Amino acid sequence: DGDEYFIGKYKEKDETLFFASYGLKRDPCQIVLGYKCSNNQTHFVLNFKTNKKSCISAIKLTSYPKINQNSDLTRNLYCQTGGIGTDNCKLVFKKRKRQIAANIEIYGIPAKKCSFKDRYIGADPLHVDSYGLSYQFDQEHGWNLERNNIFKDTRFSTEVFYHKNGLFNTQITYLAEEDSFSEAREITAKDIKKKFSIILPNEEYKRISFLDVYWFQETMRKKPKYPYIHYNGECSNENKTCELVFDTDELMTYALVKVFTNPESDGSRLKEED
Amino acid sequence: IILMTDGLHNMGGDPITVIDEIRDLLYIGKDRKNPREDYLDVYVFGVGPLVNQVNINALASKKDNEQHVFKVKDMENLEDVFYQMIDESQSLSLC
Amino acid sequence: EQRYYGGGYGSTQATFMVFQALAQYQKDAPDHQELNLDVSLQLPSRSSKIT
Ligand SMILES: *[C@@H]1O[C@H](CO)[C@@H](O[C@@H]2O[C@H](CO)[C@@H](O[C@@H]3O[C@H](CO)[C@@H](O)[C@H](O)[C@@H]3O)[C@H](O)[C@H]2NC(C)=O)[C@H](O)[C@H]1NC(C)=O
Numbered sequence: 065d066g067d068e069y070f071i072g073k074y075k076e077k078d079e080t081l082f083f084a085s086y087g088l089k090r091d092p093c094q095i096v097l098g099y100k101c102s103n104n105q106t107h108f109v110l111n112f113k114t115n116k117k118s119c120i121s122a123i124k125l126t127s128y129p130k131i132n133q134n135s136d137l138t139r140n141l142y143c144q145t146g147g148i149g150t151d152n153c154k155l156v157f158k159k160r161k162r163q164i165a166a167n168i169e170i171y172g173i174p175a176k177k178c179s180f181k182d183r184y185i186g187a188d189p190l191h192v193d194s195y196g197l198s199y200q201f202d203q204e205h206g207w208n209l210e211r212n213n214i215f216k217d218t219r220f221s222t223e224v225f226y227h228k229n230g231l232f233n234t235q236i237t238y239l240a241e242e243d244s245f246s247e248a249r250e251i252t253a254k255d256i257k258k259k260f261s262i263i264l265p266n267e268e269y270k271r272i273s274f275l276d277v278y279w280f281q282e283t284m285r286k287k288p289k290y291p292y293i294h295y296n297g298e299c300s301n302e303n304k305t306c307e308l309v310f311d312t313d314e315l316m317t318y319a320l321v322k323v324f325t326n327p328e329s330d331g332s333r334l335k336e337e338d
Numbered sequence: 339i340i341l342m343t344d345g346l347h348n349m350g351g352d353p354i355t356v357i358d359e360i361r362d363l364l365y366i367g368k369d370r371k372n373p374r375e376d377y378l379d380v381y382v383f384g385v386g387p388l389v390n391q392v393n394i395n396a397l398a399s400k401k402d403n404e405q406h407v408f409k410v411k412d413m414e415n416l417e418d419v420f421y422q423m424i425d426e427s428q429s430l431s432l433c
Numbered sequence: 434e435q436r437y438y439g440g441g442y443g444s445t446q447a448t449f450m451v452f453q454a455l456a457q458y459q460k461d462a463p464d465h466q467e468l469n470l471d472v473s474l475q476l477p478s479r480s481s482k483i484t
């Protein structure tokens with residue numbers, strides 16, 4: 065069947081930037097249509113770049129033969145430079161002594177309507193997140209829970225970091241069952257800098273209760289350096305517009321945010337832990 | 339397998355067939371989807387000027403970007419190789 | 434088979450609508466029908482799928 069590694073979400077109504085089969089034991093590759101390689105025992109790098117007015121939407125690599133190893137233990141594919149939403153990325157994939165062949169297809173969508181709000185949301189986001197996994201709750205306090213079937217890492221206390229299908233995910237802080245989803249916001253590449261902030265309504269029925277962040281970021285190594293995302297100030301009832309700043313060690317490529325509102329919320333959410 | 343033959347003028351047949359048997363026991367020379375070629379490695383070292391290089395090459399293994407067949411001028415180089423290998427892991431202090 | 438190009442009493446709105454429909458038809462319809470094949474093959478002697 066093959067080992068399929070995914071970056072981004074596949075769309076059935078789009079076109080592919082290119083598609084090529086690569087012999088991973090070749091030294092070096094064949095420069096197909098003008099793209100360079102770097103092949104080693106432990107690494108395979110494709111310095112792909114396109115000459116079309118479009119932005120990368122997804123990447124899928126199929127490795128042969130199929131080897132029974134879970135793909136959620138570590139990360140295999142990542143665009144070292146650029147990534148999803150750009151026109152080119154330096155795609156790095158780490159090989160094994162058994163994998164000897166690869167089949168790389170890359171998809172791009174027109175740069176005009178270069179948005180991903182139509183594929184990462186789904187039909188009902190109330191019970192299912194972007195990962196496609198259902199929400200699980202606990203009866204101790206009627207709130208959410210934690211998932212332990214994917215790749216996660218922590219740096220400080222009460223820090224959540226998830227990585228799946230090239231998606232980096234975080235939740236601040238926790239979500240209640242009775243809350244009703246309002247809407248979402250997206251950030252394009254042209255609106256992304258080293259540091260940037262957001263402004264959200266926090267009045268009447270738009271009282272902020274829970275937020276989640278999904279993004280695509282670059283890596284300078286197999287182990288990434290997570291951005292330092294921290295809330296500034298207090299999202300209290302007095303200040304009508306709540307704000308949040310982002311500090312990044314590595315430049316981001318895409319950003320998606322979902323808004324959860326509950327008028328009965330007190331503006332603070334933290335377990336009885338120390 | 340490491341072999342230090344100085345001669346190898348055959349007497350009693352050729353050792354190719356038994357290498358074939360060895361790799362057939364381990365399921366190496368039967369399929370290409372799972373070659374499993376890296377589970378057997380044969381290294382043969384040549385000593386002296388009376389060596390037959392084609393026989394040694396046909397007796398040893400062959401994998402790309404790697405050298406499994408060697409040859410030295412004298413027996414001294416045989417322990418020079420391994421003393422160098424020992425000294426490789428030594429700290430850079432010694433001259 | 435009709436070959437009508439306007440002319441008559443109040444034969445203007447229909448001509449405009451049919452001409453704009455024909456313009457949309459020309460703009461949208463390609464010279465052919467959709468054709469995007471993804472043909473793969475597999476060999477009992479080769480591990481990779483040649484696509
Ligand atoms: C096997 O080959 C791969 C490439 O296919 C090697 O990965 C590359 O290794 C070099 C040197 O370690 C990395 O260069 C780095 O560049 C940054 C840029 O500022 C520099 O600051 C560092 O000091 C370093 O020189 C390069 O990024 C890296 N590429 C990837 C995609 O990871 C790998 O090292 C090779 N392994 C060997 C030879 O054992």
Ligand SMILES: *[C@@H]1O[C@H](CO[C@@H]2O[C@H](CO)[C@@H](O[C@@H]3O[C@H](CO)[C@@H](O)[C@H](O)[C@@H]3O)[C@H](O)[C@H]2NC(C)=O)[C@@H](O)[C@H](O)[C@H]1NC(C)=O
Nearest residue numbers: 266272295296297298299300301302303304305306307308
């Ligand atoms: C809603 O706003 C809250 C207050 O804004 C922050 O704090 C002060 C006012 O309390 C803002 O003005 C400052 O006032 C100081 C006097 O107390 C001056 O000395 C100072 O120069 C400045 O003018 C200040 O700009 C503003 N930001 C910061 C970083 O202090 C804030 O506390 C809430 O968190 C905010 N609600 C949110 C962000 O959801």
